[PDB]
Swiss-Prot record, chain A:
Identified in a complex that contains TNPO1, RAN and RANBP1. Binds HNRPA1, HNRPA2, HNRNPDL, RPS7, RPL5 and RAN. Interacts with H2A, H2B, H3 and H4 histones. Interacts with isoform 1 and isoform 5 of ADAR/ADAR1 (via DRBM 3 domain). Interacts with SNAI1 (via zinc fingers); the interaction mediates SNAI1 nuclear import. Interacts with SNAI2 (via zinc fingers). Interacts with RPL23A (via BIB domain) and SRP19; this interaction is involved in RPL23A and SRP19 import into the nucleus. The lineage of its organism: Eukaryota, Metazoa, Chordata, Craniata, Vertebrata. Pfam families: HEAT (PF02985), HEAT_EZ (PF13513), IBN_N (PF03810). Residues 26-94 form the Importin N-terminal domain. The gene is TNPO1. This is Transportin-1.
Length: 835, 17
């Protein structure tokens, strides 16, 4: 503390040297000295007790200390920590603003990484320094308390410390009228941290808080209005009831603060419209202010002069701007007012899309895109004019105009594909393919994403141009960076999903596969760049089907290795977590999905590969995995392999079914769906041998059917599975026919007459023959299910007729008359004519 | 129809949908 103190001071002066090499070499020393027990004893000493040396040196040591708290604080001796905690609280409100801010950031850091409860008398001291007549001590404590409330937004406790916000919050509200704007801004910032959290200490002061907010509403300092605006936005959700009286006064206030001097204030005031547009009373209040708000929102969607510099041209900007916030606000408002928003948009929109200034024109196109979803039914008449114009905007000289044009066109893709292909679709697809190979990297991703969107709405409408589409996409595999390669992977994979088996042509495979095999061979099993590639190949393998035969073996082998290694590393981590790290299961999930692609694509051709491999054992380990997505992907592989090669899956049914029966829990939808679908596919292959496995599966399935909410995809899948289960073993399914048939019929009556609908109904008829007692009570639903059929197969029709006539003979021609009269006309007439 | 649930969307597909 005297013979080694100058040894550190010289390192502080040397660390401030303008030489780059000298800096990093000394910074390393302060890490090699950090491993000493009382090295941090010096850093805090220089900051507070060494008031002889210059300020930037004293500050630097305190900031080196701070970095020695954000790291290596787990090894911080309690004796030394007690020293720093005491010295900082002492020098709160130091004369030098540089030293004070250095001290303040130490307190907020120690209380952040190190926990708050480990510093007991932190809040009681800071909250008692707010009354100090020394302004610096007041600001220093208040500036720290703000960062504490931000870092510790929780620790509201309500029974952990003392609920310190019972004294702090009422004290905070008193500082809303303090002289200094810097103090007022602090006071409002602290309270705002406990608005959404429904703080009981603040909610019983909600009247004093709002009244104090109205006073600070017209403050000069923008940092005050910034916080006041944020507070009102938050109060719009949690305590809407206390704003209705002063509602229109606030809306006007927010409407001016949206056009505020400080853009920072303008953003927070703009979030008010997003919040308000999600409230039930929105469509009642804003109607008055609509003609005055709409142009303000649109005008804010223009590119600022700063953005046009960051975005070169005449992802380098923030995630949230005034532009994106106004775009979002206009998006949501469009879905609230629907077509009633058009009279406020269409006039100014007409004078925006054909404007000569590119900035003003670009913002106009964005407006057209934002209101697409909501005002769709009102924009359709204006589309035959706008759509051909936007396709021309794809050829604009400006880059930012071309990119936004791709996106706006993609939001009307549903209408374009509904129209004749050769008027909109063909020129749009052509011009969009041109922007994929654009010179500007930003326009590329915009078009490649827009094209991927176009492919989903068009599907088989792109089959004629499938050679034109592929030539552009494949060529794009040579001039694309790693950022846009992801979008390309999506566009290619989406194409295969859209055109389906139409992609299975020799000339297509000849150009589409070699670039994919290129990336395949250049990546190692640890590179996370495999995730987008194999997801793409999963769609391609499913589409190419048998055309994927010459590529199956090297793909199949590597996928098994990925799953096997991921599971092996998982076992190692489970045994010794300290020596072996946990593996990324995304490698396993992705590899399993590609295996499903092969099984679904090749079918029986994968039989030789499923055998001579341990994929069955690996799947058995994947189904037990903690991660639901892993279980989701493995169950999907089980079903696809059930159809492909059941002769290899059959010896493992005994241990598969109990796991399948366990994962019939609707908490994880996708897991429950794939499990249910797997059971159904297994039932077909088993036959009457499915008998012992039914009781541990059926009870869940019936529960899922009668279960409220739930997606239709799970209801349909559960009905088909039960139907397939009833077809193979009627004895163990028929007695419970009485209690699932009501939602069973309503679920399958809206499905087209396909194979899945056939096998399900073929089962409901089999367990109606056995125990017909269950269909009698709710026979109204079975009729509507049968009358939904247009062209059922002959044997299934005979089954329907034999059941309907059977019921008709049970009740008589007179009872059947009165019973059939409650049917709608087309349903009543169909049953009479068909059966 | 029913079948299996769609695969997990990645960064790109989720960004547009």
């Amino acid at each position: 503390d005297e013979q080694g103190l100058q040894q550190i001071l010289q390192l502080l002066k040397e660390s401030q040297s303008p030489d780059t090499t000298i800096q990093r070499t000394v910074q390393q020393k302060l890490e090699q000295l950090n491993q000493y027990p009382d090295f941090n004893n010096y850093l805090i000493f220089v900051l507070t007790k060494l008031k002889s040396e210059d300020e930037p040196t004293r500050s630097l040591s305190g900031l080196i200390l701070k970095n020695n708290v954000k790291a290596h604080f787990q090894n911080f001796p309690n004796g030394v920590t007690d020293f720093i905690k005491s010295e900082c609280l002492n020098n709160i409100g130091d004369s030098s603003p540089l030293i004070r801010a250095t001290v303040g950031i130490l307190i907020t850091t120690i209380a952040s990484k190190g926990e708050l409860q480990n510093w007991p008398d932190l809040l009681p001291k800071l909250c008692s320094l707010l009354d100090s007549e020394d302004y610096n001590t007041c600001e220093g404590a208040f500036g720290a308390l703000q960062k504490i409330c931000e870092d510790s937004a929780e620790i509201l406790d309500s029974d952990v410390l003392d609920r310190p916000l019972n004294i702090m919050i009422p004290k905070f509200l008193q500082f809303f009228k303090h002289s200094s704007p810097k103090i007022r801004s602090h006071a409002v910032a602290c309270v705002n941290q406990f608005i959404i959290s429904r703080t009981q200490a603040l909610m019983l002061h909600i009247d004093s808080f709002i009244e104090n907010l109205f006073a600070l509403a017209g403050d000069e300092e923008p940092e005050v209005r910034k916080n006041v605006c944020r507070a009102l936005v938050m109060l719009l959700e949690v305590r809407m009831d206390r704003l209705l009286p002063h509602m229109h006064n606030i809306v006007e206030y927010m409407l001016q603060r949206t056009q505020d001097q400080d853009e920072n204030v303008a953003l927070e005031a703009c979030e008010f419209w997003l919040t308000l547009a999600e409230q039930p009373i929105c469509k009642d209040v804003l109607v008055r202010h609509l003609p005055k708000l709409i142009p303000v929102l649109v005008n804010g969607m223009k590119y600022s002069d700063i953005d046009i510099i960051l975005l070169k041209g005449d992802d380098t900007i923030s995630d949230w701007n005034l532009r994106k916030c106004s775009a979002a606000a206009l998006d949501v408002l469009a879905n609230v007012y629907r077509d009633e928003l058009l009279p406020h948009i269409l006039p100014l929109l007409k004078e925006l899309l054909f404007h000569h200034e590119w900035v003003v024109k670009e913002s106009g196109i964005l407006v057209l895109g934002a209101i697409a979803e909501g005002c769709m039914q009102g924009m359709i008449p204006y589309l035959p004019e706008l759509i051909p114009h936007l396709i021309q905007c794809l050829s604009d000289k400006k880059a930012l105009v071309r990119s936004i044009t791709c996106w706006t066109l993609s939001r009307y893709a549903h209408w374009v594909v509904s129209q004749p292909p050769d008027t909109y679709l063909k020129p749009l697809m052509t011009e969009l393919l041109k922007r994929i190979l654009d010179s500007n990297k930003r326009v590329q991703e915009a078009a490649c994403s827009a094209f991927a969107t176009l492919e989903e709405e068009a599907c088989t409408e792109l089959v004629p141009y499938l050679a034109y589409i592929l030539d552009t996409l494949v060529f794009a595999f040579s001039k694309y960076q790693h950022k846009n390669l992801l979008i390309l992977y999506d566009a290619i994979g989406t194409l295969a999903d859209s055109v389906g088996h139409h992609l299975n042509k020799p000339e297509y495979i000849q150009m589409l596969m070699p670039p994919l095999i290129q990336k395949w061979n250049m990546l190692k099993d640890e590179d996370k760049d495999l995730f987008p590639l194999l997801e793409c190949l999963s769609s391609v393998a499913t589409a190419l089907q048998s055309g994927f035969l010459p590529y199956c073996e090297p793909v199949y082998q590597r996928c098994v290795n990925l799953v096997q290694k991921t599971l092996a590393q998982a076992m190692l981590n489970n045994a010794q977590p300290d020596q072996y790290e946990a593996p990324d299961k995304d490698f396993m999930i992705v590899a399993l999905d590609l295996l499903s692609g092969l099984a679904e694509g090749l079918g029986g051709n994968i039989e030789q590969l499923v055998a001579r491999s341990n994929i069955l054992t690996l799947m058995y380990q994947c189904m037990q995995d903690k991660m639901p997505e892993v279980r989701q992907s493995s169950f999907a592989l089980l079903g696809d392999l059930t159809k492909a090669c059941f002769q290899h899956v059959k010896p493992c049914i005994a241990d598969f079914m109990p796991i399948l029966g366990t994962n019939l829990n609707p908490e994880f939808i996708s897991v429950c769906n794939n499990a249910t679908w797997a059971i159904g596919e297994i039932s077909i292959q088993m036959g009457i041998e499915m008998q012992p496995y039914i009781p541990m599966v059926l009870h869940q399935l019936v529960e899922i059917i009668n279960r409220p909410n739930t997606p239709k995809t799970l209801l349909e899948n559960t009905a088909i599975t039960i139907g397939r289960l009833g077809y193979v073993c009627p004895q163990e399914v028929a007695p419970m026919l009485q209690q699932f048939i009501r939602p069973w019929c309503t679920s399958l009556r809206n499905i087209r007459d396909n194979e899945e609908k056939d096998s399900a109904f073929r089962g409901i008829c089999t367990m109606i023959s056995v125990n017909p007692s269950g269909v009698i009570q709710d026979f109204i639903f079975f009729c509507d299910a049968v009358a939904s059929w247009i062209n059922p197969k002959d044997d299934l029709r005979d089954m329907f007729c034999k059941i309907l006539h059977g019921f008709k003979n049970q009740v008589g021609d007179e009872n059947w008359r009165r019973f059939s009269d409650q049917f709608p006309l087309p349903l009543k007439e169909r049953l009479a004519a068909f059966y | 129809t029913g079948g299996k649930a769609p695969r997990k969307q990645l960064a790109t597909k989720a960004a547009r949908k």
